[PDB]
């Protein structure tokens, strides 16, 4: 799946949640120190922006995080699914 | 490369013909079930194409997606009459170079064998 936060403005995101997979599995072990930390960083930044009255008042920012697995093929597949869902808007 | 283009499109046509024969054996012409084309179904026949090409060479088929063909070594030299790329030999699983047909022999060596048996290398 993917993280989907409803908001007036949607911001996409590519984060390496999983590591490089072997010849058997596409995605490896979950990057706990790399992916999750950046995910929480972007979520905290979006929350502070939405709660900031001076910056973008009465405007909420959504989220369109997707799974990357540090692999170019999976990221391109996820971008294809995003484009197919658009053709929401980011 | 134009021969390769022709061989590629002929292989795709042969794959389409084989798919039409297998999926629709008793249907001549266009088949209604072939309209929803699938990449995997077409690749399953592209990876199994085998026919006589335009140059008489059979287009080999494999699960990898490559054709193990020869690599002819050509050379362009001036002959004062007509300069063109001259071929040397074939590549039937090994080398087939022909002496006295290259370099009109200049050799590139990292260090010249200076020692004739007395000096050290």
């Amino acid at each position: 799946n993917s993280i989907r936060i409803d908001g007036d403005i949607t911001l996409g995101g590519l984060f390496p949640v999983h590591g490089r997979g072997s010849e058997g599995k596409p995605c490896g072990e979950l990057k706990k120190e790399k992916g999750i930390h950046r995910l929480e960083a972007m979520l905290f930044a979006l929350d502070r922006i939405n709660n900031d009255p001076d910056l973008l008042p009465n405007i909420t920012l959504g989220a369109r995080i997707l799974d990357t697995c540090s692999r170019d093929t999976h990221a391109l597949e996820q971008s294809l699914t995003f484009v197919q869902a658009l053709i929401e808007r980011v | 490369k134009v021969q390769f283009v022709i061989d590629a499109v002929y292989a795709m046509g042969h794959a389409l013909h084989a798919m039409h024969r297998d999926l629709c054996p008793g249907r001549v012409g266009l088949c209604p079930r072939m309209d929803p084309v699938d990449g995997t179904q077409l690749l399953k026949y592209i990876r199994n194409v085998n026919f006589s090409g335009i140059a008489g060479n059979p287009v080999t088929f494999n699960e990898n997606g490559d054709a193990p063909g020869r690599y002819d070594i050509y050379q362009y030299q001036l002959r004062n009459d007509s300069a063109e790329y001259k071929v040397i030999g074939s590549w039937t699983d090994h080398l087939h170079l022909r002496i006295e047909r290259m370099h009109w022999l200049p050799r590139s060596i990292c260090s010249l064998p200076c020692q004739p048996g007395e000096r050290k290398k």
Binding site: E29, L30, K32, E33, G35, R38, E40, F44, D47, D67 | -
Partner: protein, 54 residues
């Protein structure tokens, strides 16, 4: 940046939904499935694995 540190220490991860990968993160971080199982009262700030990333 004390803001992210406070937001990651005070706020717990198991309560916040909508993040599907956070479940697997909590699973492979505590080294137990959801054997050496643990409880939901545990936090990440007490764990030595939490390091502020640049």
């Amino acid at each position: 940046v004390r803001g992210f540190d406070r937001y990651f220490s005070s706020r717990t991860l198991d309560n916040n939904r909508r993040n599907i990968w956070f479940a697997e993160f909590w699973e492979d971080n505590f080294h137990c499935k959801l054997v050496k199982k643990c409880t939901n009262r545990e936090r990440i700030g007490q764990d030595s694995a939490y390091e502020q990333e640049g």
